């Protein structure tokens, strides 16, 4: 995200080639509990709101950059429930403009 | 303009007019008696009402002394306007932008007069209203000053005083907003090249989306394709990747902002030791500000002293802070803060004091827009730490509005009590 | 219907044709508001001469305050105008021929050829020194307007400036007439001696806040209260309880 | 002596007539100034030394060769505002402001050589501070020469500076030819009054009036009219749309209302137009604190000066490095 | 940067002073602000 | 002044970031309004409306009672001592306060954490937002005392669905 315009090169089968987003996102929804990626740090660096589900053992450094914390244990039922509320809310908003 | 022949015509006509007025007045007085020793030898030769005759004798002899080109353009005497050094390209672009918008408004009017269905007329007037909301929209700040100026022409006494002060504050705020609106693309630049901007970005966006779809389609088939067909798909994918890299490089156009001032704080020569000698590079630290509360800084490293300043000039507009001032000339209260070993003290001052500061702090406060501040730097005087400590102090200041929000009380100036 | 839409065409025309005069008057209002109290107009010599004859023919009603309110200038300026007009008419009375007005008519006919900055009313210069006070939590009451307080300050300073100008200008006017010595070689002894101005110093001889009471005690052994010239001297030599304005 | 300072300050600080060689030199100097003003982004010593020293030198040359820095460091204040306000009440400064003379050295010559009176007190103090109430006059033996000088100076500042720039942008040699014919009109009182009563100067009055109308639009002047008359500009489109519905459900009026709407929305929304032709430096009358009767001539002081009404040719951005003033409120701050 | 406050307040203070252009998410954040909960003294009671 | 210290304690003011909350603090008479309380609340609400730096206002009661009504015993003694001007000035002040609440230009929020009788609902229920707790009790026992549901209670009771307003006002 901080370097989303850097060039890419085709090599092989690899892990498949993918460029960055052409448009800067307005919100980032994170499902990372093991903290494998730097997405929270990059979004904090680039001033983007973050919706993420926080563990009881989250570090302060990662916590303070999260705009919308949802305190829970991310079980399969709660992940489904979260995504269901998000999808239903978004499509209900989309229908109000005739789309 | 006026032709030289026309300018000669008027002065010859005026001399003939004063001669004919003398002749007609002399005759009018002569016809009633009234000998004209006050018209003759008093209005023709020995009047000398200004003392112009020495200048006449000087200029008449000077006008023939040398020769050359009688039509040659020469430099202006009362020259040095000193503000007329304006890039004329934006001036000659905005005029035809407005001309095109006005012509489009006229065509919408001439379509609305030529419509035939009232449903179609409703559609056309909606189109006209959507046009006039985007190209001919008056900002809501102007109607407040409109009502106030309506009251001002009929108010008198104390009310004229109050209305004049309020409209003066409104004039300042509207002028500032118009000159530094970030939404208006006319407040941006091209920085040396290292409504057309929106469509220029849009066509690149559409080309990028098409290239992404084609790349996805070929990458979908590479897994099942084996052999020379796979090799030619690999070459086509590589060519598409080269094209998309070339398109995404073009979206990196740095922009500066008009009206901002950029100054150099530090240029240093740093060196790294290798087995072949010393590797010497350059770092430059630069600051920028718009005199209205927005201030920023950047640091960059290149190989040459010009390229370091160019890189920091490019990156100077990406880390911008807003600083609150008290009555647009001084800070709200005294503030002391430290960054590492650089301790910085700032004190406010009354309105006719001036700014008492060193080079780095004075440049930073001048670009931020302060006018009456005293300061002192105690400890280490590293320039980069001084820049950082000034930005810490200017952001640690609690405004009266901040005290009001923090405590839920009313904060009143003491002379308004 | 056709009359109703004809009247609207006349009503739109009466704005479209007179769009420019609105811009003229609004430009004058902008010049008035960018520097507050500036009148944007350049009072002319014809208006000064009308002011002089209008004050001369009716002094008891068409006074200096009335002239200043009608012509929207400062009372100091009105006093200077009247004094200079009396001097001008005395000069023309001594000459017997009217004076040269070539400069004045040039400034009169073409006010757009020069720059003028005359002032209508005085606006005070404040120091915006930051100093606050936090109200109690259970407080009710309307805080004053900063424009109102600036108005009060400007009014007070204009009163002080007006009376200071009067005290200086009357003394200068009778110095112009010639009742004041203002030379080392024009202060000569009388036939009886010198007069003195005895002042009763001390806290018991105080005429008020500012100095002590005064009397004369003439060289012959008699003493009298002060005259108007001596009273002006007493008024103009007193200390003043303010910082120096302008 | 003095023209060498134009090479120092890269401008026209010399207020005397220029030869062709001096004009050619001044072209190169103005090119050098234009090149210097571009490279300010790469300079460290710009604000604290260069511009401060240039503005100090300009003030020293403006006030007639005086040690501005020394007389300011004598006082202990940082900002230049009270020093300059106090300097503006000096005697020879006032004599320059009233346009009774031409130069600060000429005023110093007249004051030192015992020829100017204050309240009929003949004074010889050049640095004398005048408060409000002082009366400035001359001697009766010199009054006719000073009146002649004032008349000549004003009727030649209407000519050698005013008519040369306004619609008469002729070359220098053509203007030096035509200037004798323009001089010979001014030899008589009749030739002055006829010059004043002319359609030439009336056209030049109207053109300056329209130019000064146009210059106001930089401050959003034309939008103040929209904010003033927003009701009728809505009623115009309201009438056009009501007509376009009523008289179409059941075209000269259409074309008239379209022309009216187009004229109004053109005059209310045309942007500010800027020309290459520069505005001309006019001569300022100090009517905020001095009152003049030009016949005798006589003056009376009646107020204090203003910091923003000093007739200097320095940019506000450069001068605010010395004044440190909160400009915009109209006060002496 | 060196500004103080959280994302919404810092962004609001920045866009009020004409430093940055208005981001799209600012209006959605103003319409739906993040939650707040009172102070807790750091003590968890064993149920 | 030094004379108002009882009424300052009777009507406490809480300040927040952009809001002001008036808290009724009469535990002896269970938050029953008086003419000083209504006048102070009128001044506070007028100033908070006049201020642009306040975004919304609030009304709370302290204890187990929001507001039990108005002070009728003081009016009874004032009638018994002969005069009627105290009662007249009390009624006009209370109805003016209700009218100001009904035409208030900012959001007003009324919290109801207890009993509410008489004008205690008339000062709040024309508000823009009304929050009710589980302990909230709203009743109108004016017919048992011989008075009418004054202070705008003839408005929101009349605009209830059905004949429910008649039922509640008559039966208490
Ligand atoms: Mg050290």
mmCIF file of C-alpha atoms in Angstrom, chain A:
data_model
loop_
_atom_site.group_PDB
_atom_site.id
_atom_site.type_symbol
_atom_site.label_atom_id
_atom_site.label_comp_id
_atom_site.label_asym_id
_atom_site.label_seq_id
_atom_site.Cartn_x
_atom_site.Cartn_y
_atom_site.Cartn_z
ATOM 1 C CA UNK A 1 0.000 0.000 0.000
ATOM 2 C CA UNK A 2 2.771 2.474 0.787
ATOM 3 C CA UNK A 3 4.402 1.349 -2.480
ATOM 4 C CA UNK A 4 1.455 0.385 -4.675
ATOM 5 C CA UNK A 5 3.000 1.731 -7.890
ATOM 6 C CA UNK A 6 6.220 -0.294 -7.933
ATOM 7 C CA UNK A 7 6.843 -2.435 -11.035
ATOM 8 C CA UNK A 8 6.286 -6.182 -11.137
ATOM 9 C CA UNK A 9 8.065 -8.832 -13.186
ATOM 10 C CA UNK A 10 6.850 -12.153 -14.558
ATOM 11 C CA UNK A 11 9.096 -15.071 -13.584
ATOM 12 C CA UNK A 12 7.420 -18.497 -13.481
ATOM 13 C CA UNK A 13 4.352 -20.251 -12.091
ATOM 14 C CA UNK A 14 5.433 -18.635 -8.751
ATOM 15 C CA UNK A 15 2.612 -17.874 -6.274
ATOM 16 C CA UNK A 16 0.928 -16.076 -9.250
ATOM 17 C CA UNK A 17 1.495 -12.438 -10.260
ATOM 18 C CA UNK A 18 -0.700 -9.630 -8.944
ATOM 19 C CA UNK A 19 -0.349 -5.869 -9.157
ATOM 20 C CA UNK A 20 -1.523 -3.336 -6.629
ATOM 21 C CA UNK A 21 -4.876 -1.615 -6.503
ATOM 22 C CA UNK A 22 -5.326 1.173 -9.017
ATOM 23 C CA UNK A 23 -7.509 3.088 -6.544
ATOM 24 C CA UNK A 24 -6.563 3.791 -2.946
ATOM 25 C CA UNK A 25 -8.989 1.995 -0.595
ATOM 26 C CA UNK A 26 -11.138 3.919 1.864
ATOM 27 C CA UNK A 27 -11.442 1.177 4.504
ATOM 28 C CA UNK A 28 -9.577 -2.011 5.406
ATOM 29 C CA UNK A 29 -11.301 -4.986 7.060
ATOM 30 C CA UNK A 30 -8.749 -7.262 8.726
ATOM 31 C CA UNK A 31 -9.050 -10.902 9.786
ATOM 32 C CA UNK A 32 -5.457 -11.301 10.995
ATOM 33 C CA UNK A 33 -4.987 -12.569 14.548
ATOM 34 C CA UNK A 34 -1.482 -14.042 14.195
ATOM 35 C CA UNK A 35 -0.333 -10.660 12.731
ATOM 36 C CA UNK A 36 1.233 -12.171 9.615
ATOM 37 C CA UNK A 37 0.974 -8.995 7.520
ATOM 38 C CA UNK A 38 1.833 -5.320 7.932
ATOM 39 C CA UNK A 39 -1.588 -4.117 6.796
ATOM 40 C CA UNK A 40 -2.461 -2.291 10.039
ATOM 41 C CA UNK A 41 0.920 -0.516 10.073
ATOM 42 C CA UNK A 42 0.646 0.513 6.408
ATOM 43 C CA UNK A 43 -2.941 1.730 6.827
ATOM 44 C CA UNK A 44 -1.906 3.735 9.886
ATOM 45 C CA UNK A 45 0.985 5.193 7.881
ATOM 46 C CA UNK A 46 -1.368 6.121 5.024
ATOM 47 C CA UNK A 47 -4.336 7.327 7.177
ATOM 48 C CA UNK A 48 -6.987 4.730 6.285
ATOM 49 C CA UNK A 49 -9.718 3.498 8.669
ATOM 50 C CA UNK A 50 -9.370 -0.088 9.861
ATOM 51 C CA UNK A 51 -12.137 -2.456 10.979
ATOM 52 C CA UNK A 52 -10.646 -5.433 12.784
ATOM 53 C CA UNK A 53 -11.467 -7.971 15.481
ATOM 54 C CA UNK A 54 -9.224 -7.666 18.529
ATOM 55 C CA UNK A 55 -7.910 -10.479 20.731
ATOM 56 C CA UNK A 56 -7.393 -10.094 24.493
ATOM 57 C CA UNK A 57 -3.612 -10.364 23.866
ATOM 58 C CA UNK A 58 -3.313 -7.667 21.173
ATOM 59 C CA UNK A 59 -0.266 -5.373 21.516
ATOM 60 C CA UNK A 60 -0.794 -1.707 22.307
ATOM 61 C CA UNK A 61 1.120 -0.651 19.187
ATOM 62 C CA UNK A 62 -1.218 -2.592 16.910
ATOM 63 C CA UNK A 63 -4.300 -1.707 18.974
ATOM 64 C CA UNK A 64 -3.895 2.075 18.895
ATOM 65 C CA UNK A 65 -3.940 2.148 15.080
ATOM 66 C CA UNK A 66 -7.219 0.186 14.866
ATOM 67 C CA UNK A 67 -10.118 2.594 14.384
ATOM 68 C CA UNK A 68 -13.066 0.202 14.874
ATOM 69 C CA UNK A 69 -12.244 -2.605 17.316
ATOM 70 C CA UNK A 70 -14.670 -5.500 17.704
ATOM 71 C CA UNK A 71 -13.740 -7.379 20.898
ATOM 72 C CA UNK A 72 -14.426 -11.083 20.356
ATOM 73 C CA UNK A 73 -12.894 -14.475 19.702
ATOM 74 C CA UNK A 74 -13.083 -15.040 15.945
ATOM 75 C CA UNK A 75 -14.848 -18.379 15.826
ATOM 76 C CA UNK A 76 -16.406 -19.612 12.591
ATOM 77 C CA UNK A 77 -19.932 -18.696 13.698
ATOM 78 C CA UNK A 78 -18.921 -15.179 14.737
ATOM 79 C CA UNK A 79 -16.920 -14.622 11.540
ATOM 80 C CA UNK A 80 -19.980 -15.702 9.542
ATOM 81 C CA UNK A 81 -22.247 -13.482 11.650
ATOM 82 C CA UNK A 82 -19.922 -10.487 11.220
ATOM 83 C CA UNK A 83 -19.668 -10.920 7.443
ATOM 84 C CA UNK A 84 -23.430 -11.507 7.189
ATOM 85 C CA UNK A 85 -24.247 -8.240 8.979
ATOM 86 C CA UNK A 86 -21.729 -6.403 6.778
ATOM 87 C CA UNK A 87 -23.102 -7.861 3.526
ATOM 88 C CA UNK A 88 -26.761 -7.304 4.430
ATOM 89 C CA UNK A 89 -26.111 -3.702 5.508
ATOM 90 C CA UNK A 90 -24.161 -2.924 2.335
ATOM 91 C CA UNK A 91 -26.722 -4.424 -0.040
ATOM 92 C CA UNK A 92 -29.594 -2.707 1.811
ATOM 93 C CA UNK A 93 -27.777 0.593 1.345
ATOM 94 C CA UNK A 94 -27.138 -0.216 -2.327
ATOM 95 C CA UNK A 95 -30.835 -0.883 -2.986
ATOM 96 C CA UNK A 96 -31.792 2.605 -1.748
ATOM 97 C CA UNK A 97 -30.176 4.162 -4.838
ATOM 98 C CA UNK A 98 -32.017 1.803 -7.200
ATOM 99 C CA UNK A 99 -28.970 -0.392 -7.823
#
